[PDB]
Amino acid sequence: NRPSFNEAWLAFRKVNHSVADVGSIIGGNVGKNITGGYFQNACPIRMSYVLNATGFPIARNSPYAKVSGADNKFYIYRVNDMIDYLTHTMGKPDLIVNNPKQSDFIGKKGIIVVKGHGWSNARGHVTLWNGSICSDQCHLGPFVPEVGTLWILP
Amino acid sequence: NRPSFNEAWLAFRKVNHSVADVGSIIGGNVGKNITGGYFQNACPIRMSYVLNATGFPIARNSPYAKVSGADNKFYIYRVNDMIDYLTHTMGKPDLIVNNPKQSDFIGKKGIIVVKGHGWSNARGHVTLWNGSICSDQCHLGPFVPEVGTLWILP
Amino acid sequence: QEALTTQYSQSELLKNWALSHCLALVYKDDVVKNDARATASAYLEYGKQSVEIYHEIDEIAKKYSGLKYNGSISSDFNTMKCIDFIHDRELNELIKRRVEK
Amino acid sequence: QEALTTQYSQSELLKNWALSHCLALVYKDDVVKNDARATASAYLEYGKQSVEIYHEIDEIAKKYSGLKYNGSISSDFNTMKCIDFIHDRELNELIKRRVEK
């Protein structure tokens, strides 16, 4: 099944910090790589934290690049990998929206994926959405969203 | 013949400053290129200033890369070019010293060329020498001199 | 403007990572270091390689970033260490060898 | 350590100049700008080309240094402008065309 919304939202908050702080929180190889500056985009790491924390851990043999935290659980560090991981584990998405805007997602909550153009470091973003705002809203213009995808969390 | 020593030493002092200041002093395309940051090694520019000032100007059709100053005279900007220019205009050198040290040049004054290894921006240096010190002594270790060459100035 | 990041081949991305990461090592200024760090992470995003290849590129980078370069003008020539680095034979061979194409 | 400066071919020197000069344009910190400036001058020293080729490389560099690059992480991605720059087709063609080999 899927992580409960409430547990997911709570888990995300623990790691809704600068990527350096995320490294201190999670530790292990996640922390070592952030300390070394190898990871600068915390987005897929936070999403991994959520899945790990809510009883839906990323499997070790999952076909995506990942590093372990001090918890001995696994953290995907590429956005594209995180997106693809969800496509393969979450089931059928509940909303798929071409040329999306935030107002298309009002009234529904869960895991949101937006893919678009305009960013130089990624094809898109993955976060949580509570029906009004994203969980990392405080960290987020020139990005033009092409496709919006939501998996509802109960 | 050759520039007099006294006139050469005097001329060199006018441009014995930071490369930025050299650009302000000389002006024209020398100044424009220093302002743009294209020239950072003032060594061959100062030597050009000396020849220009003392009645031995660098000829326009001389086969070396050069730019004009506000004076409409020409300033060679590569050390290797400046060295080669001297070899072709100054006549037979008066002292050539393998594995030189400063003490090999005591008692004689003129234009000194040192070529060696250890520098990452040049094969050597060209300056004036008064029998005791170089004219740019204040601006000058890991450089290992291979060959020292002096043209005596009267 | 979107950068050209998605247009690079896998080995080009690794070469681009190598350069930017090396620049992140040699420069002291925080804004510059962060910038180079952020730029390197973009090339990591699009890579298909495990993190250890970047660790190894960093191992080779540190053989250049630790060098002392001197000249007849005042400078540490930090930029030049990284330019010398990206022409490194072991770096290019490491990238060509890669298990993850 | 002496750098590898004398080992570069003429077009390699021009490419190395292009990169370092571009880095001198995009970074704000004086120590970094001076460093990149000093590094570029080393490649100019060993070139056989007239100063105008560097002026033209600078013309092309300014088409990248003026760009605004954005991402999902906080950065101006200055380093990346210069990495995109050195893959520029007009730059490589300019260098290949050169009158002074």
TrEMBL record, chains A, B:
Organism: Salmonella typhimurium (strain LT2 / SGSC1412 / ATCC 700720)
Protein name: Cytoplasmic protein
Lineage of the species this protein comes from: Bacteria, Pseudomonadati, Pseudomonadota, Gammaproteobacteria, Enterobacterales
InterPro entries, alphabetized: Tae4
A Pfam family recorded for this sequence: Tae4
Disulfide-linked positions: 134-138
UniProtKB/TrEMBL annotation, chains C, D:
Domain of life, per lineage: Bacteria
Disulphide bond pairs: 22-82
Protein name per its UniProtKB record: Periplasmic protein
Organism: Salmonella typhimurium (strain LT2 / SGSC1412 / ATCC 700720)
Source organism phylogeny: Bacteria, Pseudomonadati, Pseudomonadota, Gammaproteobacteria, Enterobacterales
